[PDB]
Design a protein around this ligand. Structure first.
Ligand SMILES: [Zn+2]
Lengths: 305, 92, 79
């Protein structure tokens, strides 16, 4: 909103049970937000209870650091993505037993579809693949070399209506499987996301009009920043990368992209996530360096009134 | 049931862990630490010796010309260990 | 919450394998360097200076470098 999102209050700190050095690398809230899902640098996934702070579960998910976590709204499936080891992404079931349903071998990034999460879109370098959650079949493949821009942090993604895909700067019509537009390059890393309002497209510092393809805004503060919208999509969270992780995060107005506030946590922010109720703010904070031989990455919880 | 590339019982801690690595070989473009590694390989180090080869100094090229009580300026206290570390650096 | 199952095994060969393949992969991403600075420091710090297990120092090394690979891959690499 306006005022509530300029102050956040620390309440608790989540730390790995039996580690001399905690190593959380990703965070996501449970499907019904009773749990905090915390992937660690060794490829595990530890579930903590948001309220109590107590660890609820621990799963052995990958060979490498967890880089992505996306639960279904259904509460029956979970998407994960690792770092350098194959399979780089996986789709698990949260039913009665935590078992892997389908494997995304070379996909470094994985994401659900937004309509009812019936399809899954993964990214393999510059290429994007679309699969079916039920059978695991690769339904579709989007790529075009003459339009490819080759971001280093490419993440293919659906718009709220899943009729469009943004992959490597290229705007695709899903059902036509034809590239609609190519957003040019002013940045080497961030591939861009869809604004929850489905009006504007946010590619790093550029906010384009999704209808006219005309540049609406330019926000310098979003440079090399990952962007997290609250459920209502009235505010943005900007966290910097390229330690290369910034020790501060910013809040913005999703309407017109003006800065709400800048919070410095004196600690290296690896990741962060909020809830749908917009009550809590989980932040993955790291201290020290390689030469300090201390990279204790911990999850601290804040509250947004 | 378990994708098996994952992951042991539970973990090592500092307050209950008291007492094969591979790693890069040959040869001449060796940073000071590829020199420290090679030194520790022989049973040397002696942090007083390596406390600073973090740099006075040495390349993977200043191995065979570092002579013997140049070693005196940088830490290895006794004459004997010094005598077959003088003669730990050859063989190639 | 779902729970199981059969994640019984490792330390041992798990540690040796982990260290190994994280090194094989990390040699593809860093330039002078070397990685030994981490390794050496660890074997110098926890192993030597606090006389702890070599497996312990190698474990902490493993952890640090998993965080390094995490960092680099999140940073992106042209290859
Ligand atoms: Zn690389």
């Amino acid at each position: 909103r306006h005022l509530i999102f300029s102050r956040f209050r620390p309440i608790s700190v989540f730390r790995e049970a039996n580690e001399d050095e905690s190593g959380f690398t990703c965070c996501a809230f449970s499907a019904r937000e009773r749990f905090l899902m915390l992937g660690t640098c060794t490829g595990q996934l530890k579930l903590y209870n948001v309220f109590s702070g107590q660890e609820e579960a621990s799963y052995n998910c990958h060979n490498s650091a967890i880089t992505h976590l996306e639960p279904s709204r259904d509460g029956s499936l979970l998407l994960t993505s690792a770092t350098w080891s194959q399979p780089l992404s996986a789709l698990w079931g949260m039913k009665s037993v935590f078992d892997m349903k389908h494997s995304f071998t070379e996909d470094h990034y994985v994401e659900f579809s937004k309509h009812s999460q019936d399809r899954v879109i993964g990214t393999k370098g510059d290429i994007a693949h679309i699969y079916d959650i039920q059978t695991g079949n690769k339904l579709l493949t989007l790529f075009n070399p003459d339009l490819a821009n080759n971001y280093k942090r490419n993440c293919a993604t659906f718009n709220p209506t899943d009729d469009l895909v943004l992959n490597d700067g290229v705007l695709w019509d899903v059902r036509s499987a034809q590239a609609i537009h190519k957003f040019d390059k002013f940045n080497m890393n961030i591939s861009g996301v869809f604004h929850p309002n489905g009006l504007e497209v946010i590619i790093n510092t550029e906010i384009w009009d999704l209808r006219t393809f005309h540049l609406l805004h330019t926000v310098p503060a979003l440079d090399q920043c990952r962007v997290v919208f609250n459920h209502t999509g009235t505010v943005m969270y900007g966290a910097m990368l390229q330690s290369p992780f910034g020790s501060s995060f910013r809040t913005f107005n999703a309407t017109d992209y003006k800065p709400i506030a800048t919070i410095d946590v004196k600690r290296n922010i690896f990741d962060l996530c909020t809830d749908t109720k917009d009550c809590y703010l989980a932040v993955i904070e790291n201290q020290g360096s390689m030469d300090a031989l201390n990279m204790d990455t911990v999850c601290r919880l804040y509250e947004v009134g | 049931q378990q994708a098996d590339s994952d992951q042991p019982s539970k973990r090592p801690r500092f307050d209950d862990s008291p007492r094969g690595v591979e790693l890069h070989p040959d040869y001449k473009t060796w940073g000071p630490e590829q020199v420290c590694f090679f030194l520790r390989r022989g049973g040397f180090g002696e942090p007083a010796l390596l406390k600073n080869i973090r740099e006075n100094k040495i390349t993977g090229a200043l191995l065979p010309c570092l002579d013997e009580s140049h070693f005196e300026n940088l830490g290895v206290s006794s004459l004997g260990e010094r005598k077959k570390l003088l003669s730990y650096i050859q063989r190639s | 919450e779902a729970p199981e199952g059969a994640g019984e095994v490792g330390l041992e060969q798990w540690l040796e394998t982990s260290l190994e393949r994280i090194n094989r992969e990390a040699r593809l991403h860093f330039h002078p360097e070397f990685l030994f600075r981490l390794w050496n420091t660890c074997v110098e710090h926890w192993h030597d200076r606090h006389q702890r297990s070599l497996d312990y120092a190698k474990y902490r090394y493993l952890l640090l470098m998993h965080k390094a690979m995490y960092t680099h891959m999140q940073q992106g690499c042209p290859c």
